[PDB]
Amino acid sequence: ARTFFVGGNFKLNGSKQSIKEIVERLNTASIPENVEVVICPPATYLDYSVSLVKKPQVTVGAQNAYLKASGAFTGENSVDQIKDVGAKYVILGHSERRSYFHEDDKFIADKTKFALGQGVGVILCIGETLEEKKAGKTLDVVERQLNAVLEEVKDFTNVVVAYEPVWAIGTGLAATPEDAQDIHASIRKFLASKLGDKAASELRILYGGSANGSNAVTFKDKADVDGFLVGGASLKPEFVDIINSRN
Amino acid sequence: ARTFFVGGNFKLNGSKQSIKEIVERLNTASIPENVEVVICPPATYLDYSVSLVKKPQVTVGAQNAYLKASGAFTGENSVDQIKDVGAKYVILGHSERRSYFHEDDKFIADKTKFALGQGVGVILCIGETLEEKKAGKTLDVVERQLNAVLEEVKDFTNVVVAYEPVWAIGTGLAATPEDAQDIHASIRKFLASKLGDKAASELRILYGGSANGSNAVTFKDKADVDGFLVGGASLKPEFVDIINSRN
């Protein structure tokens, strides 16, 4: 079926020393056979992180990139450069980019198409705000965000979707496992209509937003929740407890 | 005296191999002792670049960073992390960030203050568009851009200013040495009124915008032009000719 996937988004955090400690912990940890773990450090530490990983279940991703591989884009990251240093994924559409950096739905779509065509997988983030949720707009919002991508991207084989309610990011206010499950089940049926039944059944749809070592186990029996995108807890020992939460 | 300064802004260009070739060419180049050369690769290559330098004249800079050192800012660079890997500068306010990425004058000011307080130097970019030049607004624009920074930043000891007319960036259409000289002198005079005579006398003011190995030598006798911020030519062997242009 679907291989359980745990992404660690370090965000703007880390030093050479602290990232070494996170990666050695993973190298020495009990990790199941059938799990995919992707750690996403700042771009400054991508090469170094790859160089430290020894565990086959662990790969490295970037936190953002531009929609061209080269050119006059001072300060951007490139998917070709991410690939050059051995990383395998990029996070696109994170709420912090859509909000604070005003990245619109088409910008995210164009970046996703570009990354996939360069042979780099995408952790595609979607999610609604608190106001949007209270007004009944959750599914309309995430379907709008996905539709923009689907106009440009016809094959999600090297995509993982992360559903992260904005109001749950960093706040300690996570969605309930039942509410997450219901939203993920709706997203998957929507995508079956766009990508086909097989692709929908293969696609990992992650929960993120205050996922931690204590609540991850509460999602264990939610069939349409295929893993997590973990922010703050990815810096901490309990990241390993999340990885093992389906034991 | 003001030490001649040559910055190389690689923009969104490079690979581990092609950056190694750039740095090794600098390492073995015949260059004067009293020059300051700062190469600015993509964030993905900062640590690697620092590790390869074997030339006292050469240090490394980043192309952009955020106004905080850590936190929930997916996809940003941090001045603390740039410093951690051995880099000494950050480019702030590049036209490609101000224009395409809508980085406002206040955002640049706040980043510049932050970087300097973390012990990282700043290559501060300013410049007018074609329409602004035609309208008679060149000095009004660069004084507005500088004034925003000066509200937050009271000491330019670890600053280098890069004057880059936007219409000259990447186009082949450089300012003339006479015109650059007159603008640089006007900027220095303005800044003496704000920062004092000592500071204005010590500040490097660079020209950028289609600075290349043929035209750099034509600026050799312009007293207020202290060096160059080089984009496209920083990827090429002629970068060394620019460093040697005052021989």
SS (H, E, C) chain A: CCCEEEEEECCECCCHHHHHHHHHHHHHCCCCCCEEEEEECCHHHHHHHHHHCCCCCEEEEECCCCCCCCECCCCCCCHHHHHHCCCCEEEECCHHHHHCCCCCHHHHHHHHHHHHHCCCEEEEEECCCHHHHHCCCHHHHHHHHHHHHHHHCCCCCCEEEEECCHHHCCCCCCCCHHHHHHHHHHHHHHHHHHHCHHHHHHCCEEEECCCCCCCHHHHCCCCCCCEEEECHHHHCCCHHHHHCCCC
For chain B, give the number of residues. Answer: 247
Catalytic residues of B, by residue number, are: 94, 164
Q: What is the distance of C-alpha A214 from the center of its chain?
A: 20
Question: B170 to chain A: nearest residue by CA?
Answer: A72
The amino acid at B46: L
Residue A139: name the closest of A127, A154, A155, A152 by CA: A127
Cα distance from B222 to chain A (closest Cα, Å)? 28
Minimum-distance CB partner of A12 among B15, B44, B70: B70
Question: B17 to chain A: nearest residue by CA?
Answer: A84
Rounded to 10 degrees, the C-alpha dihedral A71/A72/A73/A77 comes to 30
Q: Measured between alpha carbons, how far is A87 from A104 in angstroms, rounded to an integer? A: 25
Q: Measured between alpha carbons, how far is A242 from A214 in angstroms, rounded to an integer? A: 8
Residue A53: name the closest of A5, A31, A20, A82 by CA: A20
Rounded to 10 degrees, the C-alpha dihedral A196/A198/A199/A204 comes to 130
Q: Measured between alpha carbons, how far is A214 from A244 in angstroms, rounded to an integer? A: 11
Give the β-pairing of A58-62 and A227-230.
Answer: unpaired
Cα distance from B63 to chain A (closest Cα, Å)? 5
Q: What is the distance of C-alpha A27 from the center of its chain?
A: 21
Cα distance from B133 to chain A (closest Cα, Å)? 22
CB < 8 Å to A43, chain B = 42-44, 77
Determine, for residues A15 and B84 on separate chains, whether the beta-carbon distance falls below 8 Å.
yes
| Burial of residue B222, with CB atoms counted within 10 A of its CB: 0-12 exposed, 13-18 middle, 19 or more buried | middle
Whether residue B121 contacts residue B88, with contact meaning beta carbons closer than 8 Å, is answered with: yes
- The residue ranges of DSSP E strands in chain B, in sequence order, are 4-9, 35-40, 58-62, 89-92, 121-126, 159-163, 205-208, 227-230
Q: Measured between alpha carbons, how far is B219 from B181 in angstroms, rounded to an integer? A: 8
Catalytic residue, candidates A103, A128, A164, A184: A164
Whether residue B131 contacts residue B167, with contact meaning beta carbons closer than 8 Å, is answered with: no
Burial B88-113 (b: 16+ CB within 10 A, else e): bbbbbbbbbbbeebebebebbbbbbb
Give the experimental resolution in Å: 1.2
Determine, for residues B169 and A72 on separate chains, whether the beta-carbon distance falls below 8 Å.
yes
Could you give all domains of chain A from N- to C-terminal order, each with its CATH number? 1-247 (3.20.20.70)
Q: Measured between alpha carbons, how far is B64 from B220 in angstroms, rounded to an integer? A: 29
For chain A, give the number of residues. Answer: 247
Cα distance from B43 to chain A (closest Cα, Å)? 5
Question: A68 to chain B: nearest residue by CA?
Answer: B12
Interface test with A, best of B74, B97, B101, B111 (most A CBs within 10 A): B74
SS3 B130: helix
Minimum-distance CB partner of B15 among A43, A71, A84: A84
Helices assigned H by DSSP within B28-127: 46-52, 79-84, 95-98, 105-117
Whether residue B61 contacts residue B88, with contact meaning beta carbons closer than 8 Å, is answered with: yes
CA atoms within 13 A on the CB side of A126: 28
Which DSSP state fits B175? P
Q: Could you tell me which residues of chain B have a Cβ less than 8 Å from any Cβ in chain A?
A: 9, 11-16, 42-48, 63-64, 66, 68-78, 80-82, 84-85, 91, 94, 96-97, 100-102, 169-170, 231
CB < 8 Å to B169, chain A = 72
Task: Give the number of beta-carbon pairs within 8 Å between A and B.
Answer: 130
Q: Measured between alpha carbons, how far is A123 from B62 in angstroms, rounded to an integer? A: 26
Rounded to 10 degrees, the C-alpha dihedral A14/A56/A117/A193 comes to -100
- Obtained via which technique? X-ray
Minimum-distance CB partner of A77 among B42, B72, B97: B42
Q: Phi/psi of residue B8, each to 5°?
A: -115, 105
Rounded to 10 degrees, the C-alpha dihedral A130/A132/A134/A135 comes to 160
CA atoms within 13 A on the CB side of B61: 30
CB < 8 Å to B208, chain A = none
Taken in order A14, A18, A24, A28, the sign of the CA dihedral is: negative
**Residues facing A10 on adjacent strands:** none
Q: Measured between alpha carbons, how far is A66 from A83 in angstroms, rounded to an integer? A: 13
SS3 B124: strand
Q: Is A214 left (phi over 0), alpha (psi -120 to 50) or beta?
A: alpha
SS3 B23: helix
Rounded to 10 degrees, the C-alpha dihedral B185/B168/B109/B65 comes to -130
Cα distance from B60 to chain A (closest Cα, Å)? 13
Residue B37: name the closest of B247, B246, B244, B243 by CA: B243
A94 is a catalytic site residue = yes
Interface test with B, best of A10, A11, A12, A88 (most B CBs within 10 A): A12
Cβ contacts of B109 within 8 Å, gap of 6 or more: B148, B149, B151, B152, B153
Q: For chain B, how long is the longest CA-to-CA vector?
A: 48
Distances (CA, A) of B127 to A83, B97, B168, B175: 34, 12, 10, 12
The amino acid at B232: G
Instruction: State the binding site of A.
Output: 9, 11
Q: What is the distance of C-alpha B237 from the center of its chain?
A: 19
Q: Phi/psi of residue A26, each to 5°?
A: -65, -40
